[PDB]
Every structure is written in structure tokens, then in C-alpha cells.
């Protein structure tokens, strides 16, 4: 007689989620963005074992409240400036809900048709919205595409299955017995490319004498040079190597680089080589028309993808990829065999009810008005001599340090490695700010990237002011 | 001026969808269990374009009800007796609810430490009920446990880990010699499990897949596996990996795992088992035996996204060494340094899977433990199970019918028998009465039934549990079984 899903439980279990989700958000603010807590605190808070009979919800909320939000990180907080923002927004986590209650598995069409056309409906609006060639879409106006899209939970993810496409591709242009060739291939990336793509070449069974870290400097604002690229290509070409695999990044995470992808194209096209676009951050940007020049040449590279999840409101997960021209590799499908699991959640009713209940107008000026608040931060950065911005900002992310000569404190540029190292701990300590960094050209430097879903341009004022504050009774 | 977090839209966009979600729960065992919908019919009545304005949520919640829910497959329906169901419960997705409204991307402990320390905690207590060996929980133990999205990256990532150090040890150069490890599987195995294996590497003609057969009810045979290891060492090959799976996709056949443990210790392989559906039964004292050896294995996988009532996704992975695991799969980028990840004390969980970001997927685990409590989960487990006998011995007392194999956990296999009727007199009119059977069954929207070979032969599987349903509709079903097949026969 124990029913899971009865109907009283249901609605009273749901409407005291959505009550806590509300006070939630009306008070991550008020909260320390960086908990105060030390490793292992929550076993000191909870019982060490299952409990043998059943509570009320309201006791399981209870210990929510007081032993599990203490102890977060709030990504939700206006005042969460790191990493990238996990942008969010009612009609993504109305969808995530929907979709944990009907709990369909869309391993095959048949298994739930819906779900199926959904996730390519969503594909092919977001691919419109991008402005990606019909290459890249299943379903066009009035016939089909030449292409396909997945959504897929993480861009690891679609690296690897670009990767291991690219890889079994290349296995059989150079005539390999099985994988008996598989230390020839060879694959490429700009040294500021993810880390976690250099792990998807390692898992799909490159060598790791064969994958290369191309080298960036300053004087291409750390984006990679194509002519750096085919002597590394030309190089493995001459020595007996198969050129593989080229990953070019728009907005990289340390310093949001940018990778000329028309000219990558390019040079990998000398040599059959797959080339995958990573976008995960600012490919959102790419809805609008004053950043799609970043994706020029778009339409000669063999795979692109980009997440939602970090800057068009949808929660996790939600990464988006797509192939151009699927058949080198009437029925309605997305590139089901290109994930690693064959059966997952139905991610797409949240990313179509994003775009059905806000529309196109609006996800641009989101974009946009997260751009003018980076812009407002970085022309304060600019206005502070005692400060400097290390990189060209081309999105909403913006890297500045404290420079050296900013005060005695600051003399060398080692002194000012730890001055903002400094800098950072006290802003996170306050409560009031969550920064971290990273290391360009051989300098620590913070991040601030803006965008958090409750942020407005007063927190992001107010956290300039606090970094104002906090250099200045450093300096004493 | 636009919030999409403001707290007016976040409240009734939620009650909006609580309201939908309670109607549906309600309706559901109304609609058809399958859709009558063409390919494309999608696009066709919602747009070819997104639009560019904004539309109140209400109309998005009507296109859900109007487009959406008609083109649907109901895995929810009390009538779904396909694959296996996906057990659901209200605390698991007011957990995933809630993960969801936070939002927190856990990659490091740091980047935000509950997510981290309750996905221990939830991990630590499954443990408990499944009563596994503490080598494979977490102050000198080297155990401990993941929680992923699906089976096939539980499989992808231990696979990685018994490749690098079989390359490690027997001397490859690079990956010259990834061309010489080889795995093993009974044939019964998901085909993700092969899939994986691809994805890693391993070359196809290395992949063994041991044929299993009526004698072992369709279990690996350890003496058959032991020959194909055998074989393949002594021709220079470097055996690596086995795949035990409890409770096969198919016909739910369960693999000797402590014989298979055994046999692979010979050469060193990596042991991993595959308890995808099966391993939720293993709370229940009287369905623990399954797992007896797993003391001796390397890695064990298991979706409570199956059968513990957590919805999609909730794969959880345990390993006897982490460091295995680590060792493959962790990186250190300069932006995720920390002085908590430096120490040592704890375990960035982006070292133990594929990405890099991830949920709050602990949270919803662990509200379902602590709102139920294990009796409950004991009595959930149970009381599928003698659904699924009261079907058996229905199926056993009508001549017409065969149980095809013995029923471990809740999935019935049965079959048209042939020399039933006139329709089923031989075996090959026996397969076309079953085909048919089923396709009848779906038809009238109160049943999806899904079929299956077993030993050359067209086999319909029946599993038990969806959460909605109750014992009357599986005695339903079965009446509405016999009546079809009584018209099918004259
Ligand atoms: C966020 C980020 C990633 C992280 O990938 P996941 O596997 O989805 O966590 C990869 N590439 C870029 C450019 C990123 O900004
Ligand atoms: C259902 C099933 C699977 C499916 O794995 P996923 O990748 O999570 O879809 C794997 N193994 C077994 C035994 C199963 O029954
Ligand atoms: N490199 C970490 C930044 C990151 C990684 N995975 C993510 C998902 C979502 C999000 O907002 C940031 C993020
Ligand atoms: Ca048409
Ligand atoms: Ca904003
Ligand atoms: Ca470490
Ligand atoms: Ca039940």
C-alpha cells in the first residue's frame, strides 16, 4: 500500500521545494558566496547511516536547511563572480521538473516520440538562432538538413565522440589493421584549450607523445596561430605521422581567447583532419549578430558545440553539438550513437521552453546586458592606475590584476603575483564576493566573470568598490 | 528590466508545473501507453523557427499539453511493462527540483563543498543497505564511489583505467600496443558495454563476446571464460578487463561473480559488475547472495534511476582503489586550484568521470534514503517482486504459455508455446503468434510490451514496478492477454 508517487505527496513535497526555492533567491544574497566550512563537516552533521523508518519531508527540509545550505557555494548569488556563471532562469527549471516527473527514457524515437523531436526542435531553433549553415541541421523549412545535433551533458563529452569519430575516421583513410595504427595519429589544440580536452584525447587512445599543446603568446592576444599550427601539422605530416584532429576554442576559460576558425579550417584541410569548434561559453554570445563574426568559417569545420548551461539560462546539464554533413558517418533523430550512454533524461523540453517562453529578442539582450555590465566593470578597471587589464575583454569575462608599481607592496612582479593572490582571499572572505584565478603569460591574475542570473549592475559596482577598498588598506 | 529569476515568474512557472505534474499523474493510466504520431509531426505543429518575441508561460504549458504529452511514450503509465520501468518517487524529484533551482556546478569540493560531502554521504549509506565490503567505502582505505549520469560511462571509465595499466605493465610503447589488450563479456551483456570498449580503443577484433546458453540459465560460464583467457594469453594478447553483469538487460540472467573474480585473478584482469537493474534487489537480505564474490572485483556499478525510485539520471560507480581511477582521469587545471583540492583531504569529483562540470545529483539520492528509509525501500523491492510472481505463476497455469527462463527479480520472460493452437503449431509459428501478440497488445493502448530472443526464440519480457502501478493492473494485463490470444487463435 506504499505509494511513491500518490497524489497528496506529490503536491505538498513540490509545493514545499518551490517555497524553499523562493526564499531562496530572495536571501543567497544575504549569505557568504564561499561557505566557512572545512572538508568533512557534513558527517558531523548528519547520522553516519540510512535511517531505518520514514520521516516527514519537512524533516528532510529541515536538514536541507540547516546542514546543506550552510555548507554551499552559492552560484546563485548575484555577488558569485567565478569561473563561468551558471546562468538560469523559471521556465529552464520549470521544464527540468516536468521532465523528472514524466521520467522517459529516448533511447530509440519509438521509446518516446516526443522527446526525440523535441531535443532535434530545440537543436535546429538554437542552430537558427547561431546562424549555422543547413549543414548542420536535421530538419530545415521545408525539407532536411545535411547535418545533425545531440545534446549531450558536458563538452568533455562532445569532444570525445568528435574525437573517436575523427579518430576511427582516420584509422581507415591510412589503411590501420583495427586500432594496430593508432600511434600514428596525431591531434592538436592551442595550449590554452581546456585541459579536459587533452584527457578526451588520453581516453580515446591517442598517444600522448602524438597530442600537441601549440604554444600561444601575447601578440595574438593568445588565440592560435595557424601559421604555429601547420608547421606542427606539416612537422607530424613529414615525420610519417596522420594528422587527426584540430580543436579550436571560442572563449577560452582562462583569458576568453579567441581561435580564428576560418583560418584553422584552413590549414587542418590540408590534411583531411576533423575539426571541432568548442564554444562552451561564448557561443551564447554568437545569437547575436555583432559576435557571430567569431564563428566565420563555421561552415568548413566538421563539428561545433556550446552549452547552454553556462550563458542561456538553462540549467544543467546541457551541452549542444553538431556535426556537419552526418552522412560520412523520413525518420526524425539526433545523433543518438554520438554520446556515451545510450539512455539519459529528456534534456530538450527545458532549452525549447526557454526559447518559447522568452523568444529570441530576449536571449540577445541577455547577452547584451551582460556585455555592457563587463563593459562598465572593465572601463572602472581601466580608470585605477594601481590596477591593469591583462587581455582585450571580448565577452563578459574580464582579467585584471593589481600591476606592479601599484605601491611598495606591489614593487616587483613577483610581489605582485602575491598581492593578488592576497587581494582574492580577502575579497572571498568577506562573504561578499567569490573570485578566483588564473596564471596569463606568466602572471597571477583574478578573474571576474559576469553574468550570475540575479546579478544587476550594482553588485557589480559594489564589488568594484570592495576591490577599491580591500587594495587600498593592503597597500596600508 | 528583464529578471528571469524574479520571484513572481519562479513561483507560478513551479505551481504551473506541479499543477501539471499532479493532473498527469492522475490521467496518465487514461492515455494510450504508446502515441499514434508519424516522424516529424513536431516541427510541423510547433514551429519551424523559435520566436522572436516573448509568450506568457501559460502558452508554453499549453503547447506542452496540446503537442508534447500526445506524442509521448508514458514509462510513468501504471500499464508500461517495457525494458525496465523507471522508478520514481516525489522526494527524489523535489530533490532534483531543488539541485536544479541551485545550481551549483560541483567539479571541485571548493567550488561548493555540500555537493561533494552529501554525494559521499549518499554513496556511503547505499553502500550500507547494499552491504557492501567497506573496501569500497571511505583512515586507510583507498575504496570509494561516484555518482554518474548512466552504466555506459560507469563502464567507459574503469575500462580506461584497466587499459592504462595493462599498457602500463606489458610494455607498450605509447599505444602501440593498445592493438593487443583484450576484454571479455558473456553475450548477454548491454550492448553498452561493447559500445564502451570501442570508444576506449580497444580493438574490435579483441572484444570477446562468450556465448551463454540454456545450461547456466544464460549466466557466463566461468570454465568458458577461463578458455577464452587462456587462449588469448597464450597467443600473446594481454587480457584485461571482464564484464560480469546480475540481472541481464534480456532476460535478467546472473552472472557467478565470485567464480568470474577468480578466473580473471589468473591473468590480472580488471573484474567490473554490471548491477544496473538488478542491483537495487540488493538491499534485501534474500537477494544479497547475488553479489556474494564482489568482495574480490575491482569496480560495481548501479542505477538507482532503475529500481530505487530516484528519476533520471543516478548511476552510482564503486571501485576498490580510486586511485586507478584518478590516476586516468584527473587534470590540474591553474584556474581550479584551491588549497582544500592541495591538501589531499578530499576528491575533486571531476577526477572520477568524463567532464569537468556537474550536478547536485547526491541531493535527490539522499532525500529519498532519509524521507523512506531502507524498510520502505526493502517493501518497495519486495512487493514488485510478488507482482511479478503473481504474473508468473498466471503465465505458468495457462498451457498456451511458457515461462522461457526462471524469475530472479521482477521481469517475467514468456512465450506463445508451440503446439498451443493452430496459429503456434511449429517453433517458427510460434515466433510470428508472439510478434503478433505484442503488436495487438500495443495497439489497444493498455499495455507497451517489448520482446526479446532467448535462445534462438521470440520472447516477450514483462517487468514489473512501474511506480504507478498497482496489482490489479498487472492482473489486467494478463486477462487482456489471454483475450487476445484466444482471438488470435481462431
Ligand atoms: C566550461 C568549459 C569547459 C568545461 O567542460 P565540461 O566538460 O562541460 O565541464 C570546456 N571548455 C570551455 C571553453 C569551457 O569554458
Ligand atoms: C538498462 C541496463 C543498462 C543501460 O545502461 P545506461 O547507459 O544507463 O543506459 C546497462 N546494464 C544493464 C544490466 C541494464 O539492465
Ligand atoms: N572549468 C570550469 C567552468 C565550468 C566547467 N563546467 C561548467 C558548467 C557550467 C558552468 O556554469 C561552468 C562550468
Ligand atoms: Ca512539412
Ligand atoms: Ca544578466
Ligand atoms: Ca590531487
Ligand atoms: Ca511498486
Redesign the pocket.
Known amino acids: 500500500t506504499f505509494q511513491p508517487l500518490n497524489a497528496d505527496d506529490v503536491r505538498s513535497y513540490l509545493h514545499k521545494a518551490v517555497d524553499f526555492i523562493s526564499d531562496y533567491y530572495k536571501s543567497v544574497e544575504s549569505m557568504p558566496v564561499l561557505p566557512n566550512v572545512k572538508p568533512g563537516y557534513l558527517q558531523d552533521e548528519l547520522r553516519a547511516s540510512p535511517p531505518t523508518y520514514s520521516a516527514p519531508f519537512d524533516v528532510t527540509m529541515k536538514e536541507l536547511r540547516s546542514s546543506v545550505v550552510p555548507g554551499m557555494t552559492h552560484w546563485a548569488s548575484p555577488n558569485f563572480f567565478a569561473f563561468?556563471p551558471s546562468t538560469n532562469s523559471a521556465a529552464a527549471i520549470a521544464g527540468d521538473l516536468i521532465a523528472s516527473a514524466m521520467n522517459t527514457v529516448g533511447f530509440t524515437w519509438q521509446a518516446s516520440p516526443a522527446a526525440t523531436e523535441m531535443e532535434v526542435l530545440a537543436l535546429d531553433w538554437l542552430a537558427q538562432m547561431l546562424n549555422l549553415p543547413t549543414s548542420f541541421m536535421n530538419r530545415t523549412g521545408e525539407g532536411r538538413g545535411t547535418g545533425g545535433g545531440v545534446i549531450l551533458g558536458?563538452?568533455?563529452?562532445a569532444m570525445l565522440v568528435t574525437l573517436v569519430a575523427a579518430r576511427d575516421a582516420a584509422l581507415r583513410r591510412s589503411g590501420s589493421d583495427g586500432v594496430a595504427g593508432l600511434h600514428r595519429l596525431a591531434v592538436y589544440a592551442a595550449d590554452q584549450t581546456?585541459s579536459?580536452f587533452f584527457k578526451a584525447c588520453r581516453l580515446a587512445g591517442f598517444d600522448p607523445a602524438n597530442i600537441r599543446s601549440i604554444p600561444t603568446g601575447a601578440e595574438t592576444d593568445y588565440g592560435l596561430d595557424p601559421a604555429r599550427l601547420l608547421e606542427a601539422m606539416q612537422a607530424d605530416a613529414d615525420a610519417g605521422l596522420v594528422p587527426t584532429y584540430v580543436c579550436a576554442?571560442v572563449?577560452?576559460?582562462s583569458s576568453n581567447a579567441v581561435d580564428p576558425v576560418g583560418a584553422v579550417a584552413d590549414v587542418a584541410a590540408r590534411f583531411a583532419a576533423w575539426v571541432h569548434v568548442?564554444a562552451?561559453?561564448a557561443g551564447s554570445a554568437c545569437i547575436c549578430p555583432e559576435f557571430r563574426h567569431h564563428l566565420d568559417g563555421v561552415e568548413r569545420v566538421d563539428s561545433i558545440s556550446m552549452?547552454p548551461h553556462?550563458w542561456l539560462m538553462t540549467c544543467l546539464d546541457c551541452?549542444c553539438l553538431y556535426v556537419r554533413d552526418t552522412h560520412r558517418l523520413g525518420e526524425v533523430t539526433d545523433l543518438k550513437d554520438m554520446q556515451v550512454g545510450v539512455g539519459r533524461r529528456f534534456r530538450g523540453l527545458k532549452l525549447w521552453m526557454v526559447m518559447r517562453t522568452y523568444g529570441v529578442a530576449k536571449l540577445q539582450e541577455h547577452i547584451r546586458s551582460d556585455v555592457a555590465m563587463a563593459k562598465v566593470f572593465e572601463d572602472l578597471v581601466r580608470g585605477d592606475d594601481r590596477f591593469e587589464v591583462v587581455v582585450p575583454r571580448n565577452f563578459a569575462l574580464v582579467c585584471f590584476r593589481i600591476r606592479a608599481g601599484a605601491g611598495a607592496a606591489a614593487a616587483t612582479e613577483e610581489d605582485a603575483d602575491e598581492a593578488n593572490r592576497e587581494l582574492m582571499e580577502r575579497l572571498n572572505k568577506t562573504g561578499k564576493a567569490y573570485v578566483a584565478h588564473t596564471v596569463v603569460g606568466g602572471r597571477f591574475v583574478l578573474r571576474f566573470a559576469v553574468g550570475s542570473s540575479l546579478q544587476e549592475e550594482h553588485h557589480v559596482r559594489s564589488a568594484w568598490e570592495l576591490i577599491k577598498k580591500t587594495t587600498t588598506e593592503m597597500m596600508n
Open positions: 563561468f558536458t563538452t568533455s563529452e581546456h579536459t576554442t572563449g577560452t576559460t568548442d562552451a561559453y552549452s553556462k551541452t
